[PDB]
Amino acid sequence: SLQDPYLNTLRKERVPVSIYLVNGIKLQGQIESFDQFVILLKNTVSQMVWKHAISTVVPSRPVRL
Amino acid sequence: SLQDPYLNTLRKERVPVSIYLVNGIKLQGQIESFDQFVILLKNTVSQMVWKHAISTVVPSRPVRL
């Protein structure tokens, strides 16, 4: 209920995000696509990130949902 | 059954919380919204935290249900 409109807004508005993984590694890019299981994160390559390995998504700017 | 009224009380009363992640990283803010999968944690930005990556939520002050 909450994460779909949130991720959709980040994708639609091309919001740069930081994605922190469960081990603390920080990824950066824009959300190109997502579903209930993964996020496709675009930077220099399109890397697929599994949501089970994500702790938090931090937008680079305030976002109006 | 327990976490829903607990998190709702924290949300309604805007209690500042610390959220500790499974890797030990400490996040801080107010609970803006939540569901069975994620918590929207508001600080300088509205960051989404996946509950599977949360170990403990610690309110900054005693609260009651």
Place this chain on the structure above:
Amino acid sequence: SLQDPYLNTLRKERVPVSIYLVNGIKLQGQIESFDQFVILLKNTVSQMVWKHAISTVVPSRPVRL
């Protein structure tokens, strides 16, 4: 089958416990309430602990179940 009567006895008899998290962090207090997903652990604050982040619960004294 096993964890419900065990946690219920710890709660009913106000047994001080140590709760070790999957990252090795040690929490301490008394079990105020619990369900199939979380434990409410009371010390100086009532902190909610997600069972998916718990490795072991260690009672401070032998307990008769």
Place this chain on the structure above:
Amino acid sequence: SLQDPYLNTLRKERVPVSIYLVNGIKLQGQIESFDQFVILLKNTVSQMVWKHAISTVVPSRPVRL
């Protein structure tokens, strides 16, 4: 299908085991009881270990089913 008779043999024969957690911490004792979620591990006290946090169970001696 495999872990149930394996753990039951360890329990019935009171074989001392080492239980390694997903963070690498080593626990030790005898399996007092178990189900599909937890192991009750008996040493100085009866500590409950969540199976989701277990990586490996190592008996102190060869055992057979």
Place this chain on the structure above:
Amino acid sequence: SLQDPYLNTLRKERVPVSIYLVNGIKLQGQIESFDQFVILLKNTVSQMVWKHAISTVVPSRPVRL
């Protein structure tokens, strides 16, 4: 819905990938096969990688679906 065509494209085109595990370890090779649980990663040997332990798949070069 996203990871299946993504991984299939990586498999069909024999794109070298880096697979980062939830502990940060980097694996490398080509995706020989995959399903909803595991990836068979081919290098000197065919190692099976459990998707629950994967954080991110990073292709060595831009790819398109």
Place this chain on the structure above:
Amino acid sequence: SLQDPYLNTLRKERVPVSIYLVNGIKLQGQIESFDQFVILLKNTVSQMVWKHAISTVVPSRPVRL
């Protein structure tokens, strides 16, 4: 679909494997038995390894599936 024939071949042909856990610990031995949840790994003792704690299984030699 993939991991059953793969693990069955490793078991049938007594292939020495290394099993890496989600914390990076390396186990070694031969797969004596397995099911959808655990692997029984034989070395000097028969230790049970939970698949939820496994990141990758690496055969010591190329294997024909």
